[model samples]
Target chain A: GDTRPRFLWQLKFECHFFNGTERVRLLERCIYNQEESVRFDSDVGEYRAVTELGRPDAEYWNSQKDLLEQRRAAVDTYCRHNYGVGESFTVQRRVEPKVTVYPSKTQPLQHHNLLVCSVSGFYPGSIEVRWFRNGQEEKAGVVSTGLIQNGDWTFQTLVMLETVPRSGEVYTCQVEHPSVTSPLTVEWRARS
Target chain B: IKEEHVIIQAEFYLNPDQSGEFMFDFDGDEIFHVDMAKKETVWRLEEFGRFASFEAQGALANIAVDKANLEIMTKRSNYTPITNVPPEVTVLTNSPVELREPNVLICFIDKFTPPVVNVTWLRNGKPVTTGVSETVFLPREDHLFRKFHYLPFLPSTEDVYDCRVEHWGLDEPLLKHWEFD
Candidate 1:
């Protein structure tokens, strides 16, 4: 297992807060700030921060210990002026998912047909895409690609399955997403 | 009278076949009973057996997972979600203005997360996409990323070359200037 990153950096200077809850439009114009939490995660690692001033890993970002304190001082001053502000708001972001299937010509492939299930265009980045053979779920010869950012506001993934498909055999790709009420399922059946 | 739940099981042991021993079993509860002699070297297994789901009044209550590579991959995908920011962009030309062959204008947009931003080129106050190439997002030590773009064109007059960045963090498109002389 790869070790987690030492720290994070979140700074949103232009992004504003006037709406109902704190929401983020990741691919919007004048997008918000995101570097505050980049500091909260550093407990201990051989970490160093150079340009980013608000890094928690480095002894001092740009060689200033109290530099990070000034950011908090600004926040504290603003909050104090805004009447000891604390607000509970909920934000939800949703993107419709798209699914596609294709045949793989590689990867431990002696089986004549290997079906690849690709689910893309979803947020939250957590998803489930399963394979079934002739109404029964198949387990072996299954491989998955980790979640991928679509470079937009969505995510994409891949799940490949070995086929037992010949005459009456059927294949199915099942997808579950947080934004969907039902798991989207697609099927493929090939015959002699 | 309440009915006892009928359990379903499946197993998939990698590198097991007629060339070896058991390969895969869809309803395999007894496959777990075998003594696994291969401890270190020959011990790459993918078996998902002996997990059950409880159903009451035809509704699923909970599921106990025995094993699944896919499910394990799902659980491993969890991470602390963070808001994404626009990149800090810098524009520079490779060759000097008094200079040479086809000049290349390079735009370096760095320190970004989620790999989502717009890098549009403006050639002499007009939008251009003829000779522009952008690199894929490259990672950093801190999990943030960097990317690059190259626009090659023949230098004419003092044409305004702008690298317009449209991001969620900027009130307007942060246009970095690189006017060619």
Candidate 2:
């Protein structure tokens, strides 16, 4: 039979990484005199410079260098691995269901509790879940144990509150994994 | 397995003042009644199965939100494992009608679970020596465990086509026969 017109889909893979040490060294050498001795460690080196330059400038350069170098390394590693990577693996879409709630019923509450979410799909155990309320940093939720059956996997988790106010509560359940473009967010509501 | 018959009745109350009752009959004999209330209704079973009836009287309540869209859905109950195959084995085709031309033969199996099946062709009760075609299994999207097969090929009058499918949970093999026209 002649080939008929059919729908076809495609999946793309990409990887990324970062390095922190090289940036600090570059900033310190540029700001301080070459003779200035900066303490360095094998894992992550530290910078110490005595210079007439403003303290803020030194600090800014040091932080900027570190971040830039880390970003560069991350991009290089991602390109090398993904572009030249040799492997054949199937890519699939995953759907996750999450529920969140505002725990504080009072003002200036010391802590806010957030519940973890659940997911079902390929290699679900490898996925990460986090909580973000009103664009602020919150404590990480507990990762759930996983189960695999018939070539598919399932994961579940519950999040606990670290800090919040008594009123005007807004929370979200965010999921992150390599397969997805951006983290998936789920809104939470007050339980009855 | 032996078949058994059953009947049930349900009742509802339409008013709290004990003014109205709604009765439902099921399985011919069972009768149930319901009492009416402003907020809540109470149901009582009267005659159960065999034959039953119920009567409701009031300002007319118990209307659902989406009553207009309600419908009764029916589905096929009888499923045959083998179809699209000849009922008999021996078939004689017209000779000199079309010589050296390829003819297509098809056999189908339906409603089998686990989607695993085998189709074999034989001539004169013996395995045919000519080029025998293989079976193709296609799965159904609605039901994951069920699948069917397709067999297509060309054969001559000297050939006897036998399509046999073997599946798990089945006691015997499903067979179909055909020949070129």
Candidate 3:
């Protein structure tokens, strides 16, 4: 091929997703060398010039009856189909972590008991798990198994708190993850 | 989903030899450019031949004001002046980090005026020259610019990485650190 001007062109189909996944704003853009020349927005239903270079093209494209109709239909055919295919893997699914708290003793004669908070089955690895006693934070004497891969894009972690609680004292495992809207708290009361 | 946005970009340049250039671009296509010597606007396409005269009228008037300001500034100042805009430096990974897998460290530098800036990568406090790639400065509002520098490496717990930036606006070089676990 012979050398030409530094001209590069691209056609892009972009979709804007809103709540409920039924409403979408789709745009088909014509670009030259990184600048948008012309665009047809689904809502606008017509082509418009983004730059002078595309003004004549926009005028010509809008006049063509068949092409104009095809562009409008692409909002459903091209954009909607792609959104449906990819949505399930991303937007439609989020796995929340399941949390459990249990009591254990490392040594038989030890006076203190270990309370382990196990959090698992979360998709995104980042999470915060804390141990609280009667709504007060238990910062020190807390240990954690940072994060373990479950091999299926899910993650698990454990936070252990060592304490000797009197009867009627309540211990809570508070978990914070992206899948839930609010912090999840599970409380356990000490029994004689 | 309610609104569709199309970016309109305007580029203005004042060079060291007392020369200037100005243009209006959409997305990346040139719409109207200024002929600074003749002080007129020229449309990139032929269809604007009729509509050109109307828009050109205002464009020429704006160019005149810019020229007048340029003359006074050049006569008064010995060197090119610049505005101090501090840049923001952030280090991010391209993907959710999986241990022992290849990943990219993206150092995004943004919102700085006078696009001249330097980026360096450091591994464990030493300069890292390999596997680094960078992009040309991209334009933003009010002469501000943004750029991205990338470094590809396998995630590991052994090494610490830092992205360091040097710009005229900063008193000292800014550094952002990253590590994998």
Candidate 4:
């Protein structure tokens, strides 16, 4: 914890689907030195514990090296629920979002086309997508393929719009997810 | 099988040994040669013709790596550019793993494309098929794929264990042996 003002990173609470079951990883810790680095991870406990120092040993840090579990309820009550040291470290594993706009019209055909705007590799399942035509938000012809998950606990989504293209028609797609500070927008238009 | 002992008569040097099932016992029951010195190799040298013997040693060395050389060629001629990037493997304790304790061993492969790779683990030159598990190919940033493998192990049992990764882009299995402290 520092006294100066700073913005924290993209903290994420990851849920993984493994072995036909869903479980959150217990902890992942990385410490960097000049020459090399060290890392540790776990999946047994409910909370994820990590630090830049060595592995957290319970006995060394505690002042009351207890005999036969003799201790007050003061320390145990606050420590068990992540009270003191937990505020400095937050769950902030960031996977950035990728946005793409597919071709509005297929080759050898000048008829109506399906424009696909895909947003992938972002974390946090909640997402929002929209379509805009000539600077106005359009909703009638939009079809949003809901959140698809990646194995690294990231997510993706696709918004499709059926359009009969006119010569001066302009289109744009916007995406909102956890990674981006602002809504990412992409455009689809006809080529000369 | 923890261990095995075969008793023989006092005359020393038993009957004709076939199948090469031999082991050297020393220090009154301590074993050193359980399954060593039993590997086979093949080599062929033809009669030197008038046009042939300039670089026979180099020719034999080429034979050893021609399988890999042929594979690198196939990647250049495929429709789906089999030149998809090879996987990167990481070692050290990630989860349930330690430097000196009996814990789970891991081989994490990631940051590659095409979403397909084969992983094999070997302990003491023997392929390990049990107690090994693999994860499905998961998507990564920049359109790449990632996966991992796990094996429960004790550090004192075997000295040399390797993780062999085979991807279409690679000419051979990327083998990096794990060493312990």
TM-score of 4: 0.32
- Candidate 1: stretches off by over 4 Å: A1-91, A105-111, B1-144, B148-181
TM of each candidate vs. truth: 0.37, 0.22, 0.39, 0.32
lDDT (tens digit, per residue) of candidate 3 on A1-192: 111212222344555555534676667665443446678888899999988766877898899989889878875775566555434443343579888787664343225888888887786576899999989999988988787533233467878888776777889999999899898887776764
- Candidates 1 and 4 compared: the better one by lDDT is 1
Candidate 2 stretches with Cα past 4 Å from truth are: A1-114, A122-124, A140-151, A154-165, A190-192, B1-181
For model 4 the local lDDT of residue B80 reads 19
Give the alpha carbon lDDT tens digit for every residue of B1-181 in model 2. Answer: 2212112111111111112222321112112334344433222221122232223432134322111111100011111121112111112221112345653333435544333345565555665435543222222221212222223344556766676656543456656676544
Q: Pick the candidate with the highest lDDT.
A: 3
lDDT per residue as tens, model 1, A104-146:
6533333466788878767657688889887889788788867
Q: Pick the TM-score winner.
A: 3
Off by over 4 Å in 4: A1-90, A108-110, B1-181
| Candidate number that wins on TM-score, 3 or 4 | 3
Tens-digit lDDT track for model 3 on B1-181? 3532222323333323233344543222233456666666665544444433424455545545445644443343333355557799988765556689997787888887554678999999998888887654544433365667878888988999999999767888999999974
TM-score of 3: 0.39
CAPRI accuracy category, model 2: incorrect
